[PDB]
Amino acid sequence: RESGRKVQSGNINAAKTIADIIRTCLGPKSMMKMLLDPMGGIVMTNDGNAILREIQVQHPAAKSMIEISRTQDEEVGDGTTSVIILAGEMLSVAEHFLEQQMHPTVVISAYRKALDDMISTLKKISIPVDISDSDMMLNIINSSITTKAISRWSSLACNIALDAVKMVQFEENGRKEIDIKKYARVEKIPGGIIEDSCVLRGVMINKDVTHPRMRRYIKNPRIVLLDSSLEYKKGESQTDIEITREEDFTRILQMEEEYIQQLCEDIIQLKPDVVITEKGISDLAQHYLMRANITAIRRVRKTDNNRIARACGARIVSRPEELREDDVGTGAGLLEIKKIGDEYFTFITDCKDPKACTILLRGASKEILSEVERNLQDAMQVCRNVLLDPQLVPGGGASEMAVAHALTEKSKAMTGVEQWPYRAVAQALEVIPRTLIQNCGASTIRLLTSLRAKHTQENCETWGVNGETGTLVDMKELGIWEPLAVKLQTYKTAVETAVLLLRIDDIVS
Amino acid sequence: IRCLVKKRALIAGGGAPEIELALRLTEYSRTLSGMESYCVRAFADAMEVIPSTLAENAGLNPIS
Amino acid sequence: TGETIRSQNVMAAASIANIVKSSLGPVGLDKMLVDDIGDVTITNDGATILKLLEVEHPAAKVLCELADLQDKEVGDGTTSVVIIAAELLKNADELVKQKIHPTSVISGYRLACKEAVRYINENLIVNTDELGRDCLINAAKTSMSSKIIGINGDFFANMVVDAVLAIKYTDIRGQPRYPVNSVNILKAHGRSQMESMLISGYALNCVVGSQGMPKRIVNAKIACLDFSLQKTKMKLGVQVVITDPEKLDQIRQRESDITKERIQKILATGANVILTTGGIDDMCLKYFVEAGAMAVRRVLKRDLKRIAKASGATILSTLANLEGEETFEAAMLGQAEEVVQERICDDELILIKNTKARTSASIILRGANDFMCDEMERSLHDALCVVKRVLESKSVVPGGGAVEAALSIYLENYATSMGSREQLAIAEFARSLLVIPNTLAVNAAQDSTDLVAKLRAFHNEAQVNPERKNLKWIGLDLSNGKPRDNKQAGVFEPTIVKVKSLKFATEAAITILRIDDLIKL
């Protein structure tokens, strides 16, 4: 058990110890964390999710740090390093001084006012990006990839991502919000030429849909969605009687061939030749579709079936009865089998249900495959954020300084006792500028001073400090950009983390 | 009920009998005298503890 | 042991009380209840957090049980009762180090509790359906957002609070009362959030079946189905084997033609409108529309049940016997007055207007963003809970922390007249009433000692009322120590939540104080 003053100081330390090295990793300039094992081995990492999971944290407040980076990772996957830095520095600067007077809830109210202050500044600072022009979105992706530090396979990945995300964009919710990227997938193929990377329609499956018989080419026939119940019944549509006797066996079997026969008949009417069954498909049942002259694909997981349903873009049905061209298989499914290797790869193309695409990636090996696939993963996150909100924000610490003076101006104007927390959130922003100064190797005093001076003359529209040139620089000129939405969400999560942690004033087991 | 049918007479509760025996037993002991006088006098004072302990639980300064 | 074990008990209860003292309301502070040593849950509200928490002291275990007993009766009072309880101990404890028996102070805590209810009885506002409880506007306003629905905060508070206090609504089939089984209010984005209105009937969230479907029927019988209509594979209607290919097809094509005939019989039994909690396929939806029946799909469970009970009679939300598209067996005769499909919130939605068994009224809220709607989920929870207590017991009590502080001098006025050993016991009861204004100061981040002082400064006689506030006690705020009137932003409590809490806390105060051991004998 901890109580009172122990807790406030604890929060700040736990945040802080995670932060020191992880802040440095942000930007093309990346410091590499050593983790030393008891076995005497080494794991070297730049990725925030990896550092956090590996280390042993004893303190419950530390665990809250870890879990908020899970929050971030789930929404984007970039800025994951960032959220704990930001969240830490709110607590350092505000907390201990204002506690002695005693007002916690005040610091919290101030955080969320300030947060709103920052969201509004962003719309002005940012200019629109065309969400159907490839060239303009491309430079943005180019900024994000080089954080990871791969810069060769990256070049391909960017472009393939652009078409993949765009084609899985079609989400309606009355306001036309896009978070859809769940129709998208990466099909991995060991082997072949290193440079054949393309996009093909629907959703393509291989994680358990590699089978020796699948009809080699389908260029017309449909897929028939089923969660049936294609398997026999020993009664009508449920089992009422058991086989344990010679007499029971004989009677029951007649019923079992009938049930199967009427199912296949409702499947064949809408003309398939490739038929998918999630489960409820037996050794006698599959033999019945062969005798129906229907190729059956069977015993393949529920996740694959969700995927194949999305690929034709047609709804599933568990309804065993009268499956129509109108209900299942709606539009055209198509099935291509290529042997890239001597292994069966299944493309399912064509989605009706406006569009859908997934990615072909061909390595020449497993290792070669992986490099592209991660960097493509960064890439389609950007593509998405640009689609979501159609403004692109200038990178680095330029955006941070704009907000830094808006809070100096707001906090003076209001002259509440919220004033001093505003001032602590203004300075919490400045860490990102300090990280970029450190990255070149110049003194913090000299470059921060100049940056502040640029606010006064030109308002830090794009004039920040960049860590790969160690000077004040127009970010637009360099081709340093990032999307608005990524900035907003990183900021968002950091205030939530700062607010929640500050509410813990006592920890009691 | 069984206690009263065995022994027909009725006495008060509240701890008053316990002081009333003690006081008589002190005086009588002194008249009688003997080496055992001290024993019967201290015994009577042993009695004085229980109504006192009771009064404390009822809430009022007990010795008083 | 002895006095010493008892003092450890006083101290144990204090530690428990400090936790719920700093976790009261939605304005409390969240705590960490480490449930193992790797597992944690973080949330606020004082009663909930004791149950989650490992209690191990005896003084701590009884106070967790106390909080739980109080909840059964009324879910308010539960964070509070614990805090009052503990305070009795602490105050009593210095009198035991002095010379005063625990027994002597504890009897005067029972007497003091009798006086305090006597005060509650003479202090009541019983018209509270035209200025509400916890004010009108203020009730809904507090658990809203302060800057997403905090500029819409007046407009939306008037909508929902007024509607909870007095509207026509169902209860449990032919019983007309106020809704203490809540109001059917949904939050859906669209349009202006300044255009919100009340519609007479139920509000439904659903996906239309319009492709031939009649969208107006006057007078209708309502099948509320907890069962997904569907149709499904059923064995042959003739023979029990197949052996020819012509019988296989005929039996299958019979499946469409028999269903159309069944729909007309369902009308004649009692249908004009079908509400199906699941979805309806395109194949199954066509049979209903052609026949002249309104068949809607994906109707929310919360709506479907609440329409069902207002539609009364016999209904198939009380049962579920049905497979597929079979004729209706007269267990689906839900009654309704008129059914208008109206375009509202930039979606077409069905409004089942009224029912013939028990009339209703609903609010369909309009946001602009999904974000607004989420926030009104929280507004609505506060309005419903506040008003729910008003509806059961019309007797309610103006003041929250204002009553307690009025009461502190009333008890002491009683204490001066009583004299003797008992005057000090009553006094200390009175000091513990004062924790209530401290606990709210805590949550507000206000000075505590400053805050109670100034409330006792406004005084004439003991009595709380909205008549004066600068010369008599009345109300508080959860973010300020200022007094407020009841047409303004003061706090109220119900009668029941206040009498049950004070009492429960006294029975607890006696039990912890009693012991003088825990030792292995």
Contact in structure between A239 and A252 (CB atoms under 8 Å)? no
User: How would you write C67-133 as a 3-class SS string?
Assistant: HHHHHHHCCCCCCHHHHHHHHHHHHHHHHHHHCCCHHHHHHHHHHHHHHHHHHHHHCCECCCCCCCC
By DSSP bridging, strand C185-188 and strand C348-353 are: unpaired
Q: Decide if A80 is catalytic.
A: yes
Asked whether A22 and A66 are in contact (CB, 8 A), the reply is no
Query: DSSP labels for A295-364?
Result: EEEES--HHHHHHHHHHHTPPP----S---TTTSS-S--EEEEEESSSSEEEEEE--TTT--EEEEEE-S
**CB-based burial, A186-201: b 16+ in 10 Å, e otherwise:** bbbbeebeeeebebbb
How big is chain B by its Cα radius of gyration, in Å?
15
Encoded amino acid at B38, one letter:
Y
Q: How far apart are CA A371 and CA A373, in angstroms?
A: 6
10 Å CB burial of residue A121 (0-12, 13-18, 19+) is: middle
With beta carbons under 8 A apart, name residues in chain C contacting A258: 235-236, 241-242
CB contact under 8 A, B59 and C99: no
**Residue A466 corresponds to which tokens in the numbers above?**
């960049």
Angle at C195 between CA C189 and CA C201, to 5 degrees: 80
Looking up tokens 């007094």 gives C483
As a whole number of angstroms, the distance between CA C333 and CA C268 comes to 11
Residue A295, beta-bridge partner list: A274
Provide, as residue numbers in chain A, all residues whose Cβ is less than 8 Å from the Cβ of C373: none
CB contact under 8 A, A237 and C232: yes
Does A262 touch chain C if contact means CB atoms closer than 8 Å? yes
Chain C: closest CA distance from residue B13 (Å): 20
Please indicate whether, in this complex, the C-beta atoms of A508 and C53 are within 8 angstroms of each other: yes
Strand order in the sheet with C40-43: A2-3, A506-508, C31-34, C40-43
| Distance separating alpha carbons of residues A35 and A22, to the nearest angstrom | 13
Question: In this structure, how many other beta carbons lie within 10 angstroms of the beta carbon of residue C383?
Answer: 30
């390093």: which residue's tokens?
A: A81
Residue with tokens 């016991």: C425
Tokens of A479: 């081709």
- In 3D space, the residue among C463, C366, C498 whose CA is nearest the CA of residue C70 turns out to be C498
Q: Is A121 a catalytic residue?
A: no
Q: Is C437:C450 a contact under the CB 8 Å cutoff? A: no
CA angle C129, C135, C138 (to 5 degrees): 125
Find out whether A89 and A432 touch, Cβ atoms under 8 Å.
no
Chains that touch B (3 or more CB pairs under 8 A): C
Cα distances from A13 to residues A7, A62, A81, in angstroms, run: 10, 9, 17
A24 touching chain C per CB within 8 A? no
Experiment type: cryo-EM
A88-105: burial string, b at 16+ Cβ within 10 Å, e else: bbbbbbbbeebbeeebbb
Closest to A500 (Cα-Cα) out of A187, A26, A112: A112
User: Angle, nearest 10°, between helix axes C370-392 and C153-165?
Assistant: 40
Cα–Cα dist A281/A302, whole Å? 13
Residue of C nearest to A322 (CA): C252
The CA distance from C333 to C353, in Å, is: 17
Q: How many angstroms separate the CA atoms of C439 and C448, rounded?
A: 8
Which chain B residues touch C101 with a CB distance below 8 Å? 56-57, 59-61
Where does residue B48 rank: exposed (0-12), middle (13-18), buried (19+ CB within 10 A)? Answer: middle
For chain C, list residues whose CB is within 8 angstroms of any CB belonging to chain B: 99, 101, 103-107, 421
Calpha distance A33→A30 (Å, rounded): 9
Of residues C258, C289, C260, the one with CA closest to residue C274: C289
**Strand A463-466 relative to strand A471-474: parallel, antiparallel, unpaired?**
antiparallel
Report the relative pairing of strands C185-188 and C197-199 from DSSP bridges. Answer: unpaired
CB contact under 8 A, A319 and C44: no
Q: Which of C130, C133, C150, C132 is nearest to C141 (CA)?
A: C150
Are C466 and C398 spatial neighbours (Cβ–Cβ below 8 Å)?
Answer: yes
User: Residue for token digits 């529209």?
Assistant: A461
DSSP codes, C194-218: SS-EEESS-----B---SS--SEEE
Q: What is the resolution of this structure in A?
A: 7.7
Q: Are strands A391-394 and A127-128 parallel, antiparallel or unpaired?
A: antiparallel
Query: Position B30: which residue type?
Result: R
Cβ within 8 Å of residue A122, ≥6 positions away: A391, A393, A399, A484, A487, A488
Distance linking the first and last C-alpha atoms of chain C? 11
In the beta sheet, which residues pair with residue C225? C276
Which string of b and e fits C216-248 if b means at least 16 CB within 10 Å?
ebeebbbbbbbbbbbbebeebeeeeeeeeeeeb
Residues C160, C163, C165, C171, CA torsion sign: negative
DSSP, res A454: H
CB A273 within 8 Å of CB A334 = no
Give the 3-state secondary structure percentages of chain A, helix then strand then coil, rounded to 5.
50, 15, 35
- Alpha carbon of B55: minimum distance to chain C alpha carbons (Å): 10
Residue that the structure tokens 């529920």 belong to: A302
C222 touches C273 (CB < 8 A): yes
How distant, in Å, are the alpha carbons of A55, C11, C19, C65 from that of C48?
A: 32, 22, 12, 12
Distance CA(C348)–CA(C345), nearest Å, equals 8
Q: Which of A429, A392, A382 is nearest to A23 (CA)?
A: A429
Kindly list the catalytic residues of C.
45, 78-79, 382
CA-CA distance, C205 to A135, in Å (whole number)? 43
Q: What is the rounded CA–CA span in Å between residue B11 and residue B57?
A: 22
| CA distance linking residue C136 with residue C154, whole number of Å | 10
CB C84 within 8 A of CB C500: no
Please check whether residue C468 is in contact with residue C402, taking contact to mean a CB–CB distance below 8 angstroms. no
Which position has the token pair 């298989």? A329
Contact (CB<8Å) C107/B60: no
Phi, psi of C227 (to 5 degrees): -105, 130
Q: Which two tokens stand for residue A247?
A: 């007499």
- For C301, what's the count of Cα atoms within 13 Å in the CB-facing half-sphere? 3
Q: Does chain A reach chain B with at least 3 CB pairs under 8 Å?
A: no
> Parallel, antiparallel, or unpaired: how do β-strands A471-474 and A127-128 relate?
unpaired
Q: Give, as one character, the DSSP assignment of residue A222.
A: B
Phi, psi for residue C162 in degrees, rounded to 5? -60, -40
And the tokens for C271?
Answer: 């249908």
Two tokens, residue A12: 């700040």
Helix axes C422-433, C402-418, angle to 10 degrees: 170
CA proximity to B59, closest of A348, A478, C92: C92
Amino acid, res. A187: E
From the CA of B60, how many Å to the nearest CA of chain C? 7
Inspect the interface and report whether the beta carbons of A175 and C255 lie closer than 8 Å.
no
CB within 8 Å: B59 and C103? yes
